[model samples]
Target: SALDGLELDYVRFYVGSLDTARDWLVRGYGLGERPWATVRSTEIGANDIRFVFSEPLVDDHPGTAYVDRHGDGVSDIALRVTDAKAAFEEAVARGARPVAGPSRAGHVVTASIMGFGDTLHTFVEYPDGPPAPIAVNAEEPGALLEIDHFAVCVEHGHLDATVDFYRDVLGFELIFAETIAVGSQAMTTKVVQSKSGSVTFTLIEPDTSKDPGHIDDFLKDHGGAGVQHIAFTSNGIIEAVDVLRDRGVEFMGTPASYYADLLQRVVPEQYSVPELRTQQVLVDEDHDGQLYQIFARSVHPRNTIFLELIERLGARGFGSGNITALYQAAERQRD
Candidate 1:
């Protein structure tokens, strides 16, 4: 199944204003801008984590309705596959709705299909080979090397169906699952990815048994189920933190108590409580190693979409404390 060969091609966002998104992504994070520009879109990247930001040029554009409905949200998650045309055909035959038929131009074959929450999964087979994994190995300051995963918030009860969309229809495997309770509110998550492990999505839906919280708050404000945040892998997190702060990026604040109660958190001498506390970075560990993460505050009008920086030192899983902190971060914003 070459469909298993799928890797991330790029994430496309449709925003109300391209310039505003441009400053936030390029100036704040220092992402490189590629010359491949359209009349309405800008192509940028930090290593292999590519992003395309665009605005609706006219009333009837493809992005017009998306920006209107979702308001500067992820419009598509383009995947790199061995054969875009074949992958499209296979996924469609497997029950994925065909959004655009495969076509080729300049040695590139690409097509689009419907993904969860009005997002599109674009299959793109480019002329290049796999990028060397450097999401956690970049030496450049504040440089994010790869996309760790995308946290997608779906409508209530649509969680299972979305998981099936990735697992059965898109030929990805379900890797991780959990039901997390945040005080009175709760949410269930199912993480899915292709066999190649190059693309991963953490699908989340509100746990109706609990009271409405940030997850439901996102669904309501964003107009439906959609991406909550994208985690970018960092190599040198301290330098990355310094750079983003120097560049005037606003990140979500963490609580001092959260650090105070670290349960004697893994005392990896490399990361001190002072530095982590000063930067508001969260820490957690699995049996293997530690994970350091921080969140950049949302620039979206509804503040529904945001970004994450995660440095994984052999930690294959996301930090639970980070999720709890995220809930608190959003909760604080609401107040």
Candidate 2:
């Protein structure tokens, strides 16, 4: 059998700017320095220019290709497998279509597979040391994204159907479930895990009303389906924000009221609004903990797919206080 450890690893998204993407690297999420890495400049289409990163982020934060594909947010996620070729073949044998295949380019080899809806999966191989195609010597500073869990959004009421898609197709297991009440509504969520639970899926419930819920909004803009926001972990958000600002990453516009009610909602009473706004991030909290988060209203009509920077301080929940903040940010962009 193809190595038992084979499965989806990272996800990627495309973006426009490369030069302005650095602050996010050194500051926003605390991903450290670069140039001991690689960032390749390429053209996606006629108007889009891209800067791709080498595989296996030199030292954590997000991976290489991820930064290139996704600007400062969670763009393309990278999946590290025991054997990339084996994983790609297995996925293809199981009905996954190939977007790219195992070819040795720079220092590594990768293969991509089509995912449900528009979501795509890539199989990555990183062999460590001396900048290879799999590695890079860093370019300028990029954004920082603490690695964490991934969340997939589905059209309203398709939670169960999606759970089965992974469990039956890729052998993942249903792990966690919860219902969060947000403004006169109940959002049910389910988590699916691979056998090892290395990767996770927190499937969200779509608001069935003619009025769409946050989940529904995401599905509508993000190319009509597939993976939605990705959650990056950060222990020091203030510092992360500083770095991101220096990098010139653009963020969705937030409201003054968001900052007005900031302390009353989740963050500490002493939290500085000017600083938060300066950094362009958002905050949320729950009984479990407080999290600092933010999103990008991507240029894609799938404007639905974006990034969420989260700093969990003793809290495991999605930043609740920031929900409306996110909504308002996106709605404004949509208008």
Candidate 3:
């Protein structure tokens, strides 16, 4: 009734430096560069996923409004819906604060509402285009992301409030939840998803009653509750990481102890232990299928965001045990 055909069309980042980000993405990620751009932003992609990076074209603009307060981070994640007007009106009436009312550019229609923190969620309807870049414009080039999810770290006490925004406002369903305690630090994580299953968000909140942890670090450094990580699922990743590494991407390294602990215990080897360890890729088969993955620490000076590469071996949920491994790994790596 509200949101239908829910899929991410594109994710746009507001940054302090477009030039630096442009080079980092264009040269980095095994991505294809597109030549036809605008004064507004620089775009890059490979297959189906598109990431746009930009700075405020004019001071005091909405784009600048975010980066000035939050530093370099995602400003908006545009979702593909069947009826933009319907979704917008429903979400607003459902208590989502409207940012931009529904507007049209010929056949294209869109509207925006503020998600938790400064990030915006825009609803889009298409007359449309191909997933791949063709030679017609000589323009340059990417997801093919199932079993994917975005991780948002919200301010303390806003966990359920934020979850409600997605469930009640945007028409998503809460699917899974867990409370992770790593030593003295513990945080709550809940996963929400569209019925269509194209877009899922993993909302996390720090347990302020306990000592501060990664979620708090994100809130403090990222300016407040915001998307701390974007996870994309790959069809395969053993070779993918190597290709990205050669293309200039640097991923977080796993400590040897993690592997030593893995050998005696496991489910399915999406790949063998040595191979997984060699690429610094982590694996967990807590489900019927195995999950292999790695992380790229944020490029931001605040070190507020992260990128995740995952290859799901018939898996449906995010790596539950691996999530703990990563959380512990983050603390150690950051320390």
lDDT of each: 0.81, 0.55, 0.76
How many backbone clashes are present in model 1?
0
lDDT (10s digit) by residue, model 2, range 15-79: 33443333333333233333334333321100011223233424343444443343233334456
| Candidate achieving higher lDDT, 2 or 3 | 3
Tens-digit lDDT track for model 3 on 1-335?
Answer: 75756777778888777766766666676455563122367676655567778777677587777877888888888887878899899888899999999998876688999997888999888776424441122122113233277888998889999888898888788887998888999989899988888788999889888899777888988888888888766656777676767777778877888887887778445577777788888887754687876888677788888888887776677667878887876766554
**lDDT score, candidate 3:** 0.76
TM-scores for all candidates: the values are 0.93, 0.59, 0.91
Best by lDDT: 1
- Model 2 scores what on Cα lDDT? 0.55
Question: Which candidate wins on TM-score?
Answer: 1
Each candidate: how many clashes? 0, 48, 7
Q: Is candidate 1 or candidate 2 better by TM-score?
A: 1
Q: Which regions of candidate 2 deviate over 4 angstroms?
A: 1-10, 14-77, 85-112, 127-145, 149-151, 171-205, 213-222, 246-250, 253-288, 297-302, 317-325, 332-335
Off by over 4 Å in 3: 35-39, 129-147
For model 2 the local lDDT of residue 59 reads 34
Better of 2 and 3 by TM-score: 3
Model 2 TM-score (2 dp): 0.59
| Alpha carbon RMSD to native, model 3 | 3.5
